[PDB]
Structure 1
Amino acid sequence: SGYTPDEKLRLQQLRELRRRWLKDQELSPREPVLPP
């Protein structure tokens, strides 16, 4: 029952990568640089 160690490890690695990707989607305070 439950995850095998391989499945668990792959889930942790994918989770770390996905959380990094979601963090990178955040906008810095100047991102909408509107031209004049």
Structure 2
Amino acid sequence: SGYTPDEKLRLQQLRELRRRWLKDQELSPREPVLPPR
């Protein structure tokens, strides 16, 4: 027997939250805003 459906719901919610966090970890093209030299 694998997961309970309760654990499956918890894993799915944590997985989508983690994927949102990792998507937010990316960098916009302006970053880093290095000052002129």
TM-score normalised according to structure 1 size: 0.93
Q: Which runs of 4+ in 1 moved over 4 A?
A: none
Q: How many percent of aligned residue pairs carry the same amino acid? A: 100
Query: Which structure 2 segments of 5+ residues have no match?
Result: none
User: For this pair of structures, how many residues does the alignment match?
Assistant: 36
- The TM-score normalised by the length of structure 2 is 0.91
